[PDB]
Amino acid sequence: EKGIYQTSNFRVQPTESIVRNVTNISNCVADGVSPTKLNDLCFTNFELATVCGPKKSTNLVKNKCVNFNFNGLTGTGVLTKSNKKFLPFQQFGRDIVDTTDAVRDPQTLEILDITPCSFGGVSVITPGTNTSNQVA
Amino acid sequence: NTLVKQLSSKFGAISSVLNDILSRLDPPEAEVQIDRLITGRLQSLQTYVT
Amino acid sequence: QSYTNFTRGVYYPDKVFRSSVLHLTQDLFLPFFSNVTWFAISGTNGTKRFDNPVLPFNDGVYFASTEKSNIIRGWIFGTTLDSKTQSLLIVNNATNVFIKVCEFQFCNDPESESGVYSSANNCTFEYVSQPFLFKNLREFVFKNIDGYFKIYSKHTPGRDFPQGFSALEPLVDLPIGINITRFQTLLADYYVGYLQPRTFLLKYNENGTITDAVDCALDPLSETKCTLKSFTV
Ligand SMILES: *[C@@H]1O[C@H](CO)[C@@H](O)[C@H](O)[C@H]1NC(C)=O
Ligand SMILES: *[C@@H]1O[C@H](CO)[C@@H](O)[C@H](O)[C@H]1NC(C)=O
Ligand SMILES: *[C@@H]1O[C@H](CO)[C@@H](O)[C@H](O)[C@H]1NC(C)=O
């Protein structure tokens, strides 16, 4: 029938991943968890900082929806240069509802703001199928 | 604000983050922890809508 | 000597940046208006210039050093503190801070240029960091968790203690699985209090510096402020 209907949701997909330099228990590459592969996890001390399993570092991608992993903190979002002033101790930023909105880059220590990649409702405007099959 | 804060709740789960559950547990166990979180979030949405 | 009017000892509970928020957190903190022993007690003004007493280490301890001349040199954290077990020896050098986990009976404890040497046997960890160094207050919090010894501090450049609020920053996080129940302060004055589990409302400004705090259990108004997550009711 003629009208506007909400049918789904649009999301922007990430196009690439970011993985962020010790190749050597502390300050070593490792090699609670029921899978047999523990090499993709970073273990604080195992008790889920250091002793993180092997991974290959990548370049830092900005202004695009990307999948990031910064010393075990993972997520999907858009990384931009931050205007926030972190203390040298602080590694992550949080919002008023306790979600992550900033990280420091493990290498070069750049402060990056994380904006989620855009999403929203899908609404279809239909003249009615008894009139036309063209929709907006 | 309440609705978004409830996403951080564990509801008795090992972790409130689905990616941590999938990364730490073999699927037959991950499904149990995920289902627990599904129940918690779905109840939160039903409460919000009501 | 009881010095109980104190309302200092707040520290950053984690390595997380927050901007213009009030964060309600349950952690180990020095209660506001707790009894902070004022060290008449110190050995150099005690009997024959010696015997600074050994204090308990209950869950964690707040310590502050008021000596602008840097006479105070360090701490030993342990249990028996008699070489039977390892103890954590933290000594402030003129150019660095040197942390050892050796077992020994004596160090400074039996005028100028007092010896600082000990048996220093069987260390498994050692750390070296930056030195601590007109009046300034040097505040420290020594907190234990299973597997770690965390030291928080703030060196604030003061005769009168009721100065403005300043939160302590983490100084070092030592992954030392050491059982600590007693500790001794090595002098060659002191404000020492003990931490308790408490909920605090911490005010973070736009730059992420904690500027104020409410101890929820101190009084009814602090409880209302915590309930509403506001410093204004
Ligand atoms: C290795 O990591 C350190 C972390 O501070 C960074 O400063 C350094 O530049 C990194 N090495 C390279 C080659 O980028
Ligand atoms: C620490 O030492 C005390 C000594 O009295 C002992 O009672 C306690 O059980 C010890 N704790 C651990 C975890 O070793
Ligand atoms: C943050 O600190 C800098 C230090 O120079 C200061 O200039 C700036 O105004 C501060 N911002 C706020 C919001 O306090």
DSSP secondary structure code for residue A2 in this structure:
-
Q: Could you tell me the CA-to-CA distances from A63 to A46, A78, A111 in Å, in that order? A: 36, 6, 14
Q: What is the DSSP letter of A99?
A: -
Residue in A48, A134, C72 with CA at minimum distance from that of residue B24: A48
What gap in Å lies between CA A105 and CA C115, rounded to an integer? 45
d(CA C176, CA B17): 29
In 3-state terms, what secondary structure has residue B11? coil
Question: Whose CA is closest to atom 10 on ligand 3?
Answer: C207
- The size of the A-C interface in CB pairs under 8 A is 39
Cβ atoms C22, C201 nearer than 8 A = yes
Q: Which of C16, C4, C25 is nearest to C213 (CA)?
A: C25
**Residue C64 to residue C142: CA distance in whole angstroms:** 11
Query: Terminal CA-to-CA distance of chain A, rounded, Å?
Result: 14
Q: What percent helix, strand, coil does chain C show, rounded to 5?
A: 5, 40, 55
Nearest CB partner across the interface for A98, out of B8, B20, B24: B8
CA C90 centroid distance within chain: 12
CB of residue C207 inside a 6 A radius of ligand 3: yes
Query: How far is C197 from A96, CA to CA, in rounded Å?
Result: 24
| Token pair for A3 | 């009208």
- Its sign, for the CA torsion C21, C22, C28, C30, is positive
Look-up: residue for tokens 């015997």?
C51
The tokens describing C213, both together, are: 């705090």
Residues in Cβ contact with C117 at an 8 Å cutoff, skipping those fewer than 6 apart: C107
As a residue count, chain C comes to 233
What are C108's two structure tokens? Answer: 């400074």
Picking from C194, C183, C187, C216, the residue whose alpha carbon sits closest to that of residue C81 is C183
Reported as type and span, the H/E element at residue B18 is helix B18-24
d(CA C138, CA C89): 18
Chains C and A touch (3+ CB pairs under 8 A): yes
Q: Which of B5, B25, B29 sits opposite A97 (nearest CB)?
A: B5
Residue with tokens 């997380």: C16
Q: Which of C145, C156, C130 is nearest to C13 (CA)?
A: C145
B1-7 — which CB contacts under 8 Å span 24+ positions? B1/A96, B1/A97, B2/B48, B3/B44, B3/B45, B3/B48, B4/A97, B4/A99, B5/A97, B5/A98, B6/B40, B6/B41, B6/B44, B7/B41, B7/B44
Question: Residue B3: how many CB atoms within 10 A of its CB?
Answer: 13
Contact A34 B1 (CB under 8 A): no
Instruction: Please tell me which residue of chain A has the smallest CA distance to B25.
Output: A34
